[PDB]
């Protein structure tokens, strides 16, 4: 970020990036130009000695389609908050679900990974989400250096019309009822971290009536993760079991799913950072005769070269291990490999 304002206790950071990005793939819905930019602001205001106020906005602007194309920009984050010294912080708005407090440890691939793979955005509390109220406490009230926990509540984001509607309605794959989540992370050793996260949300009428797959009044996630980040080495894994909460492509939700991500990286001092990872999502108890199915399965190999802190370039190669079957065909799940080439200017 670039601090563009700092005066009389108030600070404003402007940040973002421009990613000149191209995908190569036999999947024609993935292939071609993928250039986009992000822009955001982070602001902080000193209220008194024990109270600081803050806000953050993050905006995604696609730049790979035409000037007449529709819906090419959207807000990723918009929240306002208060920080009460060592008693914690509280914020409300569009923010990350606290499950990401753990799964973010494997969201480090050169290009792929993260939301869109084993979980999505607007997908209960697994990633970015509307209407989340988040209490956080770092180093447990100042007692325990390295122990962090979060408690989070989300109100219902319902259908567009009818009985289950809210003002901000959306389709069933992005709906949620009232829900809550919790996370806990700790520095178990020098450079080694362990984390656990839990979420429980009500499902909506349309999730239990419109798609073919997935039935249940509640969505639940359980997550455990490990991270090692020292001596130029980064290793991380996350394992998550979900109920009625992992998407089964366009067909609905998986009544149960088991998701696993693991990644290994090395940082060379001259700027090169090679990366290898493996990601899978196994759905279980699927209706309509599908039974157990692979929702995602691939090996990732790539590398980033950091020219400096404001410029980088990368290659990323998704080695897709899914087979073509009637589930992947009916759910719209991609089974082809992808190669990505990126050149990134960051401010």
């Amino acid at each position: 970020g670039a601090e563009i304002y700092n005066k009389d206790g108030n600070k404003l950071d402007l940040y973002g990036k421009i990613d000149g990005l191209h995908y190569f793939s036999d999947d024609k819905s993935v292939d071609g130009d993928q250039t986009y930019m992000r822009v955001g602001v982070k602001g902080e205001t000193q209220i008194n000695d024990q109270l600081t106020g803050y806000g953050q906005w993050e905006y995604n602007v696609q730049a790979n389609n035409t000037e007449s194309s529709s819906d090419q920009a959207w807000t990723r984050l918009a929240f306002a908050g208060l920080k009460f010294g060592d008693a914690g912080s509280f914020d409300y708005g569009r923010n990350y679900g606290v499950v990401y407090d753990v799964t973010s440890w494997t969201d480090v691939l050169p290009e792929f990974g993260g939301d869109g793979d084993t979980y999505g955005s607007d997908n209960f509390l697994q990633s970015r989400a509307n209407g989340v109220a988040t209490y956080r406490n770092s180093d447990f009230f100042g007692l325990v250096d390295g122990l962090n926990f979060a408690l989070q509540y989300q109100g219902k984001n319902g259908s567009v019309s009818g009985e289950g509607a809210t003002n901000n309605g959306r389709g069933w794959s992005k709906q949620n009822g009232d829900g809550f989540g919790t996370s806990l992370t700790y520095d178990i050793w020098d450079g080694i971290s362990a984390g656990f996260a839990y979420s429980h949300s009500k499902r909506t009428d349309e999730q239990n009536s419109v798609p073919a797959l997935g039935r249940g009044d509640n969505a639940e996630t359980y997550t455990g993760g490990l991270k090692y980040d020292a001596n130029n080495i980064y290793l991380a894994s996350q394992y998550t079991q979900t109920y009625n909460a992992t998407r089964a492509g366009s067909l609905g939700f998986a009544n149960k799913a088991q998701n696993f991500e693991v990644v290994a990286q090395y940082q060379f001092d001259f700027g090169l950072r090679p990366s290898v990872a493996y990601l899978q999502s196994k759905g279980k108890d699927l209706e309509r005769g599908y039974g157990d199915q692979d929702i995602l399965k691939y090996v990732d190999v790539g590398a980033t070269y950091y020219f400096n802190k404001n410029m980088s370039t990368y290659v990323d190669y998704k080695i897709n291990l899914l087979d073509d079957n009637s589930f992947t065909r009916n759910a719209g799940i991609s089974t082809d490999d992808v190669v990505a080439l990126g050149l990134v200017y960051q401010f």
Copy 2:
């Protein structure tokens, strides 16, 4: 506003806010998350001793729906202008109709009130409007302290297609023909003020042919206002009489309406600002047998706590006095109560 540039006679302010906001209501179309943000730029350039140029843009970005949702951002203001000392200023673009020069005096509720209630945006010269040319004069050419006036013209904003079209066409509720408006305000003492505004607009063909309610070739408004703003006390009222200009929800326009708003507030030293308000809009001579109908009617009780100039929080309680009847149902007018809670970061 944060001044981020001031050099060689040109200066640029970046301003805006992030409002983590939630509505509670039995009305499903307003209940739920309402988080949004605003960002704007204000610029001015000294041209010579008697002439300054300026420009301003204000953008609204909703953050309460998903990243795939449509139409989540829009321009509230965009205009350029010239200021010639005592002889006045002139600007053109998307700006406030001069009726709001007076009706803004009651637009001070913690959350509710303002446009959307007794008047709307893109609603002739009553609020933000496309294509307004505005001449303004402060202190009557420098000769009468506290005496301000404005003259304004607006070109036709017509239909999407057909004989009544313009390039920037829209639906009947937000169309207008050629029109003009005037405003005048007088600061008797530094806080105490009286104001008047007038506007007159050609109506468009679709305003008479498409909706069921409201017929006439001309839209007119007459507004008077009073304000007391001193000694930590704020009192304000406005009364407006419209002809063919006040929307009757989705049913069309009211042939005549009488609108009234009044607000009482007190500013405590430690930051709390309680607020009480009453608002009503009475439609008259409506077609299809509706006769006289209330379009808006509620009492508002709330409060804002100002942590400082960059952070605030508020509660606002709209106690709705409308009856659930045939007019309100067919017009899509809300008759339920609403509670708003908000946490605001401001730059």
Copy 3:
């Protein structure tokens, strides 16, 4: 531009403008409020003595319609790049096609001209374009001052669905296959040439009625005089299957000509006269040879300073109303533009 950050090898420039703009015309799809704003950021970071990285983003935000209108903002430019000494520069993203390296010389009118007239945006490599990789060299490796050249590649931007699709599919009028282009300019008189050749897509040969062929080509030569308060410029372009025939398709062949003359007075006034035409040949469905564009332009800009200007522009449209202009949606009416512009 406004330099809002400059620290430790890293610079950020913020730029843009707010244009309070009104059109007067008998053409109702053109007449009325046209107010809009542009905002953009230009950044650059010093990597080492020879290597600089950069990026630029330019956004267009319409302000002439309501707060519930659709599709009112879009990205004009977004690219990242590397600059290495006299070896040149390389960037990738949404950027200008190298044909505009020469046709930009006539894109100097007070309001009209430029994309939308003899060429469009997202129109192979004639203007702003998705997915362009652009190599540029200034002063021929530092050996010849004023000699500039550019080499450019564009990947396919295909249909929304079917086997001709890409992730970023669009309609046939804004599709392209793989393409390349090159530009050459030599510098107060300058001469320029540009060439581009792209594959066409299958929806371009099946969906619209006009224009057929596997390849789109453009050839451009231009001339510019810019000194002694005088600006004169001309460009002539021949295209094949590359110029739009309104909403009807493409012209199998087109000849485009633009020429402009302006003078800058010391107190601020910049009068301007221009002529633009686009002649389409060999059109199907009985259209044959048709005028696609034909007008004379007269206007003037007054600059108050570098941050504020105002202008008037008069398009005197010479197109005749006929079956082609009507079915294609081409305007044959005159337009008057009045604008007041704050720039940062």
